[PDB]
mmCIF file of C-alpha atoms and ligand atoms in Angstrom:
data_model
loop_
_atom_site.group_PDB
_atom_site.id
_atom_site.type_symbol
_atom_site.label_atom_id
_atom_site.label_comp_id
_atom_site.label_asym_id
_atom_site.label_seq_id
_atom_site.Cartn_x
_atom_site.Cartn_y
_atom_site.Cartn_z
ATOM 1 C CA UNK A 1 0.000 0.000 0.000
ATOM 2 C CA UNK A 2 2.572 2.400 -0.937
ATOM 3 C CA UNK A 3 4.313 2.664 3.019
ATOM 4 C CA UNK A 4 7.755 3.874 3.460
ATOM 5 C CA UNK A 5 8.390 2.219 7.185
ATOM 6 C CA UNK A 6 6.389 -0.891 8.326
ATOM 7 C CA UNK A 7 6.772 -2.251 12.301
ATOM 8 C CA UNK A 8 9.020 -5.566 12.786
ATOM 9 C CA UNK A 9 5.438 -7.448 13.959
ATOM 10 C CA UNK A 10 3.825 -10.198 12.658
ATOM 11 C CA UNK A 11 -0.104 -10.294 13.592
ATOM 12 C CA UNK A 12 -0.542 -13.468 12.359
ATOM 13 C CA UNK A 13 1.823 -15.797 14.285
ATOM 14 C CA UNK A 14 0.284 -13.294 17.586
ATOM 15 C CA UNK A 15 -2.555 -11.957 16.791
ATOM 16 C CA UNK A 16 -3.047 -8.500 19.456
ATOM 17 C CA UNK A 17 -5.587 -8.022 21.454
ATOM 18 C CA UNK A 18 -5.455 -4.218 21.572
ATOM 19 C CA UNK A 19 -3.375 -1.909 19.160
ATOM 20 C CA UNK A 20 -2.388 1.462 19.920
ATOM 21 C CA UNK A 21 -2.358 4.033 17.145
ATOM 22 C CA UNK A 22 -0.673 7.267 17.970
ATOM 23 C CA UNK A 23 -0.278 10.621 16.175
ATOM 24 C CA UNK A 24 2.528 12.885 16.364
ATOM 25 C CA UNK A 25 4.447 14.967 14.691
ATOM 26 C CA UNK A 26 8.158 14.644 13.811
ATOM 27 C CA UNK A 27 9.358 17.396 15.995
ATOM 28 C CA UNK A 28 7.358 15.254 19.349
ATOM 29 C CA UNK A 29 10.225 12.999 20.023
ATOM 30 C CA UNK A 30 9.697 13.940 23.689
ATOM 31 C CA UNK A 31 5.610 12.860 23.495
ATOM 32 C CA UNK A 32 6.654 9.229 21.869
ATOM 33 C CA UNK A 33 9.009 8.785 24.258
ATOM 34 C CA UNK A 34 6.930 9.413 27.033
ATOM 35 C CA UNK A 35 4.328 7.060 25.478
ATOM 36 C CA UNK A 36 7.295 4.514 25.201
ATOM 37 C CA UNK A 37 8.219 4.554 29.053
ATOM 38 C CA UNK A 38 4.333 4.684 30.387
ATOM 39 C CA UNK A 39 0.865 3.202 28.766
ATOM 40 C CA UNK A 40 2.807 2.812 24.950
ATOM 41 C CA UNK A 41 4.807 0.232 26.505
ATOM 42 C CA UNK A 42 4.389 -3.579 25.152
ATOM 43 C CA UNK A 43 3.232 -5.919 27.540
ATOM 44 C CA UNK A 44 0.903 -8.641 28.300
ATOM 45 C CA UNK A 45 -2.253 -7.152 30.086
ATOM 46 C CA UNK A 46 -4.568 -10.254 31.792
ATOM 47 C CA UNK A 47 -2.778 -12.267 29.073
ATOM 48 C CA UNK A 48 -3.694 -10.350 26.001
ATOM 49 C CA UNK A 49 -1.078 -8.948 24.005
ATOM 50 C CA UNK A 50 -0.459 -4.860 23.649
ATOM 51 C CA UNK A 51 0.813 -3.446 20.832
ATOM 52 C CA UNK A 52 1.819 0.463 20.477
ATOM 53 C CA UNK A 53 2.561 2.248 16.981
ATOM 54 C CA UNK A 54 3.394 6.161 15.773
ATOM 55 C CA UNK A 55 1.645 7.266 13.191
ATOM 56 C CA UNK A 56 4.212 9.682 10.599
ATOM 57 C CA UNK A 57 3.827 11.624 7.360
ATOM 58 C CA UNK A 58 6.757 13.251 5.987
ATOM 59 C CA UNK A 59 8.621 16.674 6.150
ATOM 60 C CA UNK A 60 10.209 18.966 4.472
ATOM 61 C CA UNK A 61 12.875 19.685 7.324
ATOM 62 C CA UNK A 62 16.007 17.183 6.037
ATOM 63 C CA UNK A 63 16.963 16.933 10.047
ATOM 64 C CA UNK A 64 13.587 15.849 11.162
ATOM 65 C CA UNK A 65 13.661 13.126 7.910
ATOM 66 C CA UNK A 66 17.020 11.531 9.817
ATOM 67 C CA UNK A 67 15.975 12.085 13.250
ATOM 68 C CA UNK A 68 12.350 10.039 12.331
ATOM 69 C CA UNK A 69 14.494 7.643 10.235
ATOM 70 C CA UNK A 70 17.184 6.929 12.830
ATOM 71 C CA UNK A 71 13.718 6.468 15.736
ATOM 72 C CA UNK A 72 12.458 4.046 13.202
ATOM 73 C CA UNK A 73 15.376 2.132 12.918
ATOM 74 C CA UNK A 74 16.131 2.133 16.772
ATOM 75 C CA UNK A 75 12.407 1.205 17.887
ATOM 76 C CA UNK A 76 10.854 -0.210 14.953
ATOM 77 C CA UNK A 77 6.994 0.924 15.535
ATOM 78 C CA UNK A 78 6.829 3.869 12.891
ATOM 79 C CA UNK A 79 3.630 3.350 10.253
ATOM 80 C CA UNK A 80 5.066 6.222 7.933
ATOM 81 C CA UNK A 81 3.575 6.884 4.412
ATOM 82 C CA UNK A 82 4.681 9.998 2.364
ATOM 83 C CA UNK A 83 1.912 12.528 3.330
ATOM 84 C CA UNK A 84 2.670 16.407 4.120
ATOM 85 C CA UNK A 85 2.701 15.355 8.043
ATOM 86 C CA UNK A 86 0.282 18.895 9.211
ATOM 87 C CA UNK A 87 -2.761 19.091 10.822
ATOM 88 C CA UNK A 88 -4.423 19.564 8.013
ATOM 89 C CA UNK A 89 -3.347 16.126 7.049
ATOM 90 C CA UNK A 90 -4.469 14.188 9.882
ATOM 91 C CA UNK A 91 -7.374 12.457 7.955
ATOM 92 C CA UNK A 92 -4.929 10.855 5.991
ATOM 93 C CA UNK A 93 -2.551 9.511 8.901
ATOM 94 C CA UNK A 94 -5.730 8.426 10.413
ATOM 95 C CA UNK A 95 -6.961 6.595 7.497
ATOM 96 C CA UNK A 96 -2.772 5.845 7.403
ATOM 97 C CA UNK A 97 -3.185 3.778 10.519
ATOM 98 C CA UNK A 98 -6.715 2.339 9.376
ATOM 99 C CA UNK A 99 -5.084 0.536 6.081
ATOM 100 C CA UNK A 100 -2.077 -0.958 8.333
ATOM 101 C CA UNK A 101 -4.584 -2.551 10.326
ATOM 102 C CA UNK A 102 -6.324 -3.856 7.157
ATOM 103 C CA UNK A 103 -3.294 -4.802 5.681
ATOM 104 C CA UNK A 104 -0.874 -5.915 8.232
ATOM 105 C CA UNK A 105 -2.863 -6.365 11.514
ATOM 106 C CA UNK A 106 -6.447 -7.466 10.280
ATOM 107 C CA UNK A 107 -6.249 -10.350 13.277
ATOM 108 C CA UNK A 108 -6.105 -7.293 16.266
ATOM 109 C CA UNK A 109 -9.397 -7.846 18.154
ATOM 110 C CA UNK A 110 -9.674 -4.047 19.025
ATOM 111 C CA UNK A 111 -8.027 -1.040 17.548
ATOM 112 C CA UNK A 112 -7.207 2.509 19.597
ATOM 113 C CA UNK A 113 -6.844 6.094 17.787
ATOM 114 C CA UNK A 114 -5.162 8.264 20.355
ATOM 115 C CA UNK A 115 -3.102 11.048 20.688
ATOM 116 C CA UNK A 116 0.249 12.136 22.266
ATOM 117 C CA UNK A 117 -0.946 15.020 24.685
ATOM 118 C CA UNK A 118 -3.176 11.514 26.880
ATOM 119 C CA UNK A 119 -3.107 9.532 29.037
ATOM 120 C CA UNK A 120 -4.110 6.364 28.618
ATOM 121 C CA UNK A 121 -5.461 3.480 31.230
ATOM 122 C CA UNK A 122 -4.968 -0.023 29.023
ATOM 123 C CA UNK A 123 -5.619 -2.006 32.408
ATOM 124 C CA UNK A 124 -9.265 -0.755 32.516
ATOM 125 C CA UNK A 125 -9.862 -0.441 28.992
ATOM 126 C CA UNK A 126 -8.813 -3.999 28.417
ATOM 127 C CA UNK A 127 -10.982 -5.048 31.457
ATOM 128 C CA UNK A 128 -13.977 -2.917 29.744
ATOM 129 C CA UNK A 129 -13.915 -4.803 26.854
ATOM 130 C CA UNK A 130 -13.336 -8.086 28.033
ATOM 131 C CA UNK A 131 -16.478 -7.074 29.735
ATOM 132 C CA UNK A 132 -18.625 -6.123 26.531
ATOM 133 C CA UNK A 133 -19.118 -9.194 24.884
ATOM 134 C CA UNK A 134 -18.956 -7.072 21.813
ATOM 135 C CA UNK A 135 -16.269 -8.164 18.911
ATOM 136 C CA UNK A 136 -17.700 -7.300 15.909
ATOM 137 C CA UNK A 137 -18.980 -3.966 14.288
ATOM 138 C CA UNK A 138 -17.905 -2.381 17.171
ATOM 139 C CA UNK A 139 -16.952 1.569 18.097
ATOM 140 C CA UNK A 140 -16.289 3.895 21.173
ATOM 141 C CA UNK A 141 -15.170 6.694 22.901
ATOM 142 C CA UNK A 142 -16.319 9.909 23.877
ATOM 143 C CA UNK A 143 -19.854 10.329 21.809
ATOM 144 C CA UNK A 144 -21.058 13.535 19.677
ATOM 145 C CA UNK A 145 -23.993 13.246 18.231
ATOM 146 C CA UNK A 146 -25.215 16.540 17.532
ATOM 147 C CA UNK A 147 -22.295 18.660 16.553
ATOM 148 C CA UNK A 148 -21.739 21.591 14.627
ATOM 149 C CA UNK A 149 -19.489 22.498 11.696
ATOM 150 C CA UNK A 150 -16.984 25.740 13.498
ATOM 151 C CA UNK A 151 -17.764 28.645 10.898
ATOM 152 C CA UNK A 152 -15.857 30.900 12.899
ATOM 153 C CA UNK A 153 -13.333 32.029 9.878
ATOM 154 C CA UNK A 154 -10.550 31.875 12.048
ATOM 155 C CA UNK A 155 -11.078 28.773 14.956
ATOM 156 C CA UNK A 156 -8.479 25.933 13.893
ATOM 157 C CA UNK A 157 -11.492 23.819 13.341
ATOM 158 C CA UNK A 158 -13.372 26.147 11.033
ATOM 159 C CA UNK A 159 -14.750 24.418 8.269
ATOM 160 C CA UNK A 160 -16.220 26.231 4.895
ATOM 161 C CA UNK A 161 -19.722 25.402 3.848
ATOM 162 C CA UNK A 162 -17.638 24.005 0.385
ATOM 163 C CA UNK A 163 -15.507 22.058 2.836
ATOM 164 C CA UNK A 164 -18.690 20.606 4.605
ATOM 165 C CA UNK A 165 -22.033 21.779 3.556
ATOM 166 C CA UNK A 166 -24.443 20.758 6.214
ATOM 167 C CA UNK A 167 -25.950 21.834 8.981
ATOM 168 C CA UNK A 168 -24.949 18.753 11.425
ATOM 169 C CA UNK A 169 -21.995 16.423 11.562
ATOM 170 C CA UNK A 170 -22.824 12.831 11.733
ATOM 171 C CA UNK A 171 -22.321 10.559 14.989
ATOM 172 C CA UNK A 172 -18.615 10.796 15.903
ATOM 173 C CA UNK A 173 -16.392 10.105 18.895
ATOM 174 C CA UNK A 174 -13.241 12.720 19.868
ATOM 175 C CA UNK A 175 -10.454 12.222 18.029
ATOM 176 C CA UNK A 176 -8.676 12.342 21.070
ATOM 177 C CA UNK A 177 -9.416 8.709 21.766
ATOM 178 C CA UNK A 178 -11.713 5.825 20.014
ATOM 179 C CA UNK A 179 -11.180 2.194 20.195
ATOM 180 C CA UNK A 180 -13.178 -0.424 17.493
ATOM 181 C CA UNK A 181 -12.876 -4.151 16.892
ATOM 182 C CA UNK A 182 -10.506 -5.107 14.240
ATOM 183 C CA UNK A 183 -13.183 -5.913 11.462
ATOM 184 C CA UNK A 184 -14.101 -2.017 11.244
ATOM 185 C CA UNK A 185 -11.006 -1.120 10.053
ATOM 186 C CA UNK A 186 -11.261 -2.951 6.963
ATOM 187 C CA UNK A 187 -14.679 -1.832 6.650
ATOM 188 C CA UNK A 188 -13.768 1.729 6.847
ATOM 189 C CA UNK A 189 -10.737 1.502 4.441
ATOM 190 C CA UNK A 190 -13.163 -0.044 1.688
ATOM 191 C CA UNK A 191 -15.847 2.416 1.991
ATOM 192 C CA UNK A 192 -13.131 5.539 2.591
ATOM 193 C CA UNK A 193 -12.623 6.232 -1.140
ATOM 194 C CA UNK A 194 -16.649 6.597 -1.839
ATOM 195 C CA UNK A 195 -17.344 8.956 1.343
ATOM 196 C CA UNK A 196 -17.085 12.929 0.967
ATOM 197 C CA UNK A 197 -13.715 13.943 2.402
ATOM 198 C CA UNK A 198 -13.164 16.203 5.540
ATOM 199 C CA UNK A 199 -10.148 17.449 7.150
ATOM 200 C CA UNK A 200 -11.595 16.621 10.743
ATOM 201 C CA UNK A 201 -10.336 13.123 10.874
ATOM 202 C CA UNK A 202 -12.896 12.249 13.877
ATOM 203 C CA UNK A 203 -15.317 13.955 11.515
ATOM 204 C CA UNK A 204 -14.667 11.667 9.018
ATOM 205 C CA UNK A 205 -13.958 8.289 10.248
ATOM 206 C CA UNK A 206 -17.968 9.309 11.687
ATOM 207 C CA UNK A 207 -19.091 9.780 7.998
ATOM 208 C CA UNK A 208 -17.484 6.693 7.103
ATOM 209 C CA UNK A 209 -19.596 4.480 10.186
ATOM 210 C CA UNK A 210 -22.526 6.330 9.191
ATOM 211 C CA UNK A 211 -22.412 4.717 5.542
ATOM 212 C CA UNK A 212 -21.312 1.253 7.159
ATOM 213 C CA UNK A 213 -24.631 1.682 9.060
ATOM 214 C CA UNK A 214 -22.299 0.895 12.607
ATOM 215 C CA UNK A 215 -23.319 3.044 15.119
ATOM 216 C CA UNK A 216 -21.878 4.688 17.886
ATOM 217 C CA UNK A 217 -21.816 2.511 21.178
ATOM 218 C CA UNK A 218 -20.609 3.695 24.744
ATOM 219 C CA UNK A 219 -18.058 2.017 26.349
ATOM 220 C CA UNK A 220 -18.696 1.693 29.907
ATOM 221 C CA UNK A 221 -22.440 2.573 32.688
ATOM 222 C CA UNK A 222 -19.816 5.549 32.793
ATOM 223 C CA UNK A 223 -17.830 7.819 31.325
ATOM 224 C CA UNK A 224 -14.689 6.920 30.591
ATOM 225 C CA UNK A 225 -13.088 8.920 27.668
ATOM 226 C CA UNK A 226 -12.087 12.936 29.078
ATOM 227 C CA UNK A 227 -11.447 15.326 26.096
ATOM 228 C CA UNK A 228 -11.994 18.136 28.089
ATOM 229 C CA UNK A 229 -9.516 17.031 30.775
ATOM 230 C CA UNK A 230 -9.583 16.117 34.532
ATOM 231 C CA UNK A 231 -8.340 16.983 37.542
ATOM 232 C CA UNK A 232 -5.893 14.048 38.592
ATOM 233 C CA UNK A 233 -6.462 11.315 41.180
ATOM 234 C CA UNK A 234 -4.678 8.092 41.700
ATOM 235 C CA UNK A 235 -8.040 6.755 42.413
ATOM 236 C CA UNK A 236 -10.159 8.796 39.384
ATOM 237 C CA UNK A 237 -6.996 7.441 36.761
ATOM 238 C CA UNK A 238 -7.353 4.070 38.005
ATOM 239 C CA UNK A 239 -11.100 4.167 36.620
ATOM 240 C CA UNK A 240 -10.954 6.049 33.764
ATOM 241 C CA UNK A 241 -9.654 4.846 29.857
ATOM 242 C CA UNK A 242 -8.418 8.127 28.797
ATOM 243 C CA UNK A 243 -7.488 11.861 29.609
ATOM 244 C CA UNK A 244 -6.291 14.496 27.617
ATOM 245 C CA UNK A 245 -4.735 18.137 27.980
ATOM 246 C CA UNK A 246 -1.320 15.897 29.173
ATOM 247 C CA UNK A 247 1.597 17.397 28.088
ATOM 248 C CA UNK A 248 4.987 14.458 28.483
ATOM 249 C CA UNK A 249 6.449 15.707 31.992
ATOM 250 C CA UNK A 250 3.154 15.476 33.651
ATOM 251 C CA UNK A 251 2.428 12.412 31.889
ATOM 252 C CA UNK A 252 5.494 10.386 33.153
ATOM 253 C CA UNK A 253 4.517 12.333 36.725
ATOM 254 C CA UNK A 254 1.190 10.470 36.517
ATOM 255 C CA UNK A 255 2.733 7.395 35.316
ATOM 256 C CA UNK A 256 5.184 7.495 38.816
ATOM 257 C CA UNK A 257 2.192 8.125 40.769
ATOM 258 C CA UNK A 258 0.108 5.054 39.597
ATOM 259 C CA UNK A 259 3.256 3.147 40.205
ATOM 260 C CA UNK A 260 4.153 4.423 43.423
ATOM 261 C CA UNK A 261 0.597 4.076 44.968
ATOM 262 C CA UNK A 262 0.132 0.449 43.329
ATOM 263 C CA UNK A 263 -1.317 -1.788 46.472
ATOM 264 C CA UNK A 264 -2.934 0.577 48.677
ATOM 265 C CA UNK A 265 -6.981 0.636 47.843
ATOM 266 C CA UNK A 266 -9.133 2.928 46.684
ATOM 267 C CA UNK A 267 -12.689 3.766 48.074
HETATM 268 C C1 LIG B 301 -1.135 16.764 2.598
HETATM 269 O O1 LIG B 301 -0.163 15.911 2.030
HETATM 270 C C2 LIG B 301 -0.236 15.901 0.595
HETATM 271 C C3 LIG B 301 0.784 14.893 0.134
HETATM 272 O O2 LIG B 301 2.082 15.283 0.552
HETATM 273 C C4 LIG B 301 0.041 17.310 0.084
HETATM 274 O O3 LIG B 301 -0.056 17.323 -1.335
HETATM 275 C C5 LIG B 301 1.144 17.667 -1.944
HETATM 276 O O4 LIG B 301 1.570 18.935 -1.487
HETATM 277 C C6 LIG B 301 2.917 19.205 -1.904
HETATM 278 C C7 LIG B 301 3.358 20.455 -1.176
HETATM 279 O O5 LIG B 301 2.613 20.650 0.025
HETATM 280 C C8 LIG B 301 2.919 19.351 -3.421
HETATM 281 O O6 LIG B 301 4.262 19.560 -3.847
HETATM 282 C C9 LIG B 301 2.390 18.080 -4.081
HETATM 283 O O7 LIG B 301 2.173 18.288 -5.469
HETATM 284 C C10 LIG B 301 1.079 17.597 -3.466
HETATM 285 N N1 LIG B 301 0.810 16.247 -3.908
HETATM 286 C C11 LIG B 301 -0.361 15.628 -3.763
HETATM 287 C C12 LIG B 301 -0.306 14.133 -3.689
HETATM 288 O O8 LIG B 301 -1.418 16.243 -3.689
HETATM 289 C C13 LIG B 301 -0.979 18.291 0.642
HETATM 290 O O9 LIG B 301 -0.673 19.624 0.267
HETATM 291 C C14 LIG B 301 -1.014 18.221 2.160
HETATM 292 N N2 LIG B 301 -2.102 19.030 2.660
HETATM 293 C C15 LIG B 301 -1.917 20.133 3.381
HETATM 294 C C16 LIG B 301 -3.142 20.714 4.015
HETATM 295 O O10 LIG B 301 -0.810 20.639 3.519
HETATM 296 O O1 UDP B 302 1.388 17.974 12.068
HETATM 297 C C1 UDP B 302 0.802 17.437 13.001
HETATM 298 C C2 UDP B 302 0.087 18.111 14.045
HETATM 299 C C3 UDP B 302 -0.499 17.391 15.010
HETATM 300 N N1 UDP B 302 -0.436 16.020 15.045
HETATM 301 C C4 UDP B 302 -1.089 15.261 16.120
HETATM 302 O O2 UDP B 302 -2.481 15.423 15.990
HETATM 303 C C5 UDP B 302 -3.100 15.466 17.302
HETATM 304 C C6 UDP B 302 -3.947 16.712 17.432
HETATM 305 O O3 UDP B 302 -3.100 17.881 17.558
HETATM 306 P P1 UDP B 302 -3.273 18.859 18.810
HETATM 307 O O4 UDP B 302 -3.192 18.059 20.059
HETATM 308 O O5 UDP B 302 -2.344 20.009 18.674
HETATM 309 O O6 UDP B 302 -4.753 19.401 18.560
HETATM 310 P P2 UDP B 302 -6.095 19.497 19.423
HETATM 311 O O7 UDP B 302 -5.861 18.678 20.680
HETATM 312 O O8 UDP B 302 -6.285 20.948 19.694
HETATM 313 O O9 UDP B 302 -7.158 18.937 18.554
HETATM 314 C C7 UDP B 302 -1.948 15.308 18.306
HETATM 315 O O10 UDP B 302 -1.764 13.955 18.690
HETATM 316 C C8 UDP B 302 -0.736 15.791 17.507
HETATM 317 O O11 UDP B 302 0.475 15.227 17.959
HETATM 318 C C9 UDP B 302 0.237 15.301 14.079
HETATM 319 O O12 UDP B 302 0.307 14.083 14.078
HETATM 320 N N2 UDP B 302 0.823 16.062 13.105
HETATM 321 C C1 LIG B 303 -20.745 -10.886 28.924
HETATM 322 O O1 LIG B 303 -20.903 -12.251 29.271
HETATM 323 C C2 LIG B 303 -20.675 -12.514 30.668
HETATM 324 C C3 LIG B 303 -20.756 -14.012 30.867
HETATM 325 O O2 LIG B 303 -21.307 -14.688 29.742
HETATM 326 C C4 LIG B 303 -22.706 -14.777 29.759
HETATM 327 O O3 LIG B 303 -23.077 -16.005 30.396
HETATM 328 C C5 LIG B 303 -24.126 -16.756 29.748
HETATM 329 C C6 LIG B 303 -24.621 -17.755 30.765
HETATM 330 C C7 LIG B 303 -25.220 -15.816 29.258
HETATM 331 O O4 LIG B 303 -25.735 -15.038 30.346
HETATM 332 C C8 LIG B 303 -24.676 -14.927 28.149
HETATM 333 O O5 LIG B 303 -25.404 -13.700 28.101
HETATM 334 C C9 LIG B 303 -23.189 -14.625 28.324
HETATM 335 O O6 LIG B 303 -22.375 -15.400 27.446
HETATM 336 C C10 LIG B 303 -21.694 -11.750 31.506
HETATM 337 O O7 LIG B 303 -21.417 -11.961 32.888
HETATM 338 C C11 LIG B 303 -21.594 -10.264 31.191
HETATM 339 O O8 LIG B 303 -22.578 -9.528 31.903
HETATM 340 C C12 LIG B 303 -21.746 -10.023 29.693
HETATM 341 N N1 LIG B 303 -21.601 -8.612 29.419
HETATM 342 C C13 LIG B 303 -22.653 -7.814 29.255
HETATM 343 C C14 LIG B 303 -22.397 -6.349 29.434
HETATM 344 O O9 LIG B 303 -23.761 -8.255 28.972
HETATM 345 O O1 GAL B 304 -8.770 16.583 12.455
HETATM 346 C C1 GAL B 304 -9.730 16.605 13.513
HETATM 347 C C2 GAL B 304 -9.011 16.629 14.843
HETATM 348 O O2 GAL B 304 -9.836 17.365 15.778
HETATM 349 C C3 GAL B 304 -9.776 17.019 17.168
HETATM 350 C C4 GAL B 304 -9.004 15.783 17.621
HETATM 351 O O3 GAL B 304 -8.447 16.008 18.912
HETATM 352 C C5 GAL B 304 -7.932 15.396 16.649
HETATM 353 O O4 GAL B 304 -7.294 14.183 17.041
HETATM 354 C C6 GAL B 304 -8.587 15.235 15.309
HETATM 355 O O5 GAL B 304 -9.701 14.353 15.388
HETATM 356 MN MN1 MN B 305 -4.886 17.531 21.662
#
């Protein structure tokens, strides 16, 4: 499928239980790192295996090229196709990361979007979906259902009525975080092509399950996903899938917490 860097895994001889899918760009070594030394980090998690990949376009910058290309060759879990790597690009690293799966990983039981500035809990969130019964068809996160398009000329998420010419979005979840079962992702790569393009990628991942007729399904009694962000808790983090507005220092902080208070209870 036209990739310039693959990940040294092979689904088939151990098929994942959970992939991680994260975006950043070049310049966020400090973000992947982060990732790397707290919830990005490969394990086995009540048995089931973890997997953790970046998500890269390309750059201009000749520095940033070597600096992603000597990462690559160091860790080996870069997905990298030659896209102008801005945000205005993120719809194609999404659907980047939605044609490995289909291509390389179609065996994963359950996929994760996220992004660098979270946290993530893959203890509960395995635990949640271990707990759903649901393996097929399947997407979650944080549900909007009735947004609107930003017409504000200047917002970064301002979108022309020639970009999107509607009133309403269709169903989504944040962008932030959303986890489906493997199947979708081939579903959505198939149908991708024949769906009106946005630059949201949340947006349109959400036009793409509206034409697969899957709809939007809540994870957990309650909330889990945090877009808007939340005060921290050993306790509230150790019940929660994801939280964003974490920048990498506070995110390793977190990380040290959760591993310092491991054993003592919580009421
Ligand atoms: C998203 O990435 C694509 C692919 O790199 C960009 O399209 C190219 O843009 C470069 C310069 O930005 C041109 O030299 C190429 O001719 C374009 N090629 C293709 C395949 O279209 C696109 O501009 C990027 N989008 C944004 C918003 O920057
Ligand atoms: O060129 C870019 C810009 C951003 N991002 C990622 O896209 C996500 C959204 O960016 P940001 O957090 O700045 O936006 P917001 O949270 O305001 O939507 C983050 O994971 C960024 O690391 C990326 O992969 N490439
Ligand atoms: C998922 O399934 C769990 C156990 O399996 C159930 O047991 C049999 C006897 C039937 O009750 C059948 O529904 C299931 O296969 C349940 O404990 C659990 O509640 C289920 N999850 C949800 C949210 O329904
Ligand atoms: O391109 C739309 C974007 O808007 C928001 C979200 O946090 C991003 O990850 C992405 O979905
Ligand atoms: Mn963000």
């Amino acid at each position: 499928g036209n990739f310039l860097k693959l990940p040294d895994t092979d689904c088939r001889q151990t098929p994942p239980f959970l992939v991680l899918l994260v975006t950043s760009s070049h310049k966020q070594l400090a973000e992947r790192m982060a990732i790397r030394q707290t919830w990005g980090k490969e394990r086995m998690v009540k048995g089931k295996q973890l997997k953790t990949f970046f998500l890269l376009g390309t750059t201009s910058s000749a520095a940033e090229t070597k600096e992603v290309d000597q990462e690559s060759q160091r860790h080996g879990d870069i997905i990298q196709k030659d896209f102008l790597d801005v945000y205005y690009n993120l719809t194609l690293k999404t659907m980047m990361g939605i044609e490995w799966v289909h291509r390389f990983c179609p065996q994963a039981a359950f996929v994760m979007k996220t992004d660098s500035d979270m946290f993530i809990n893959v203890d509960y969130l395995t635990e949640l979906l271990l707990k759903k019964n649901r393996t097929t068809r399947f997407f979650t996160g944080f549900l909007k259902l009735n947004e609107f398009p930003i017409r504000q000329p200047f917002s970064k998420w301002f979108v022309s009525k020639s970009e999107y010419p509607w009133d309403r979005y269709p169903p989504f979840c944040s962008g932030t975080g959303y986890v489906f079962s493997g199947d979708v992702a081939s579903q959505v790569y198939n149908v991708s092509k024949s769906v009106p393009y946005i630059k949201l990628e949340d947006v349109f991942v959400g036009l793409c399950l509206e034409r697969l007729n899957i709809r939007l399904e809540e994870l957990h009694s309650q909330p889990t996903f945090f877009p808007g962000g939340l005060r921290f808790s050993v306790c509230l983090f150790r019940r929660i899938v994801a939280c964003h507005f974490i920048k990498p220092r506070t995110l390793l902080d977190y990380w040290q917490a959760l591993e310092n208070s491991r054993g003592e209870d919580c009421p």
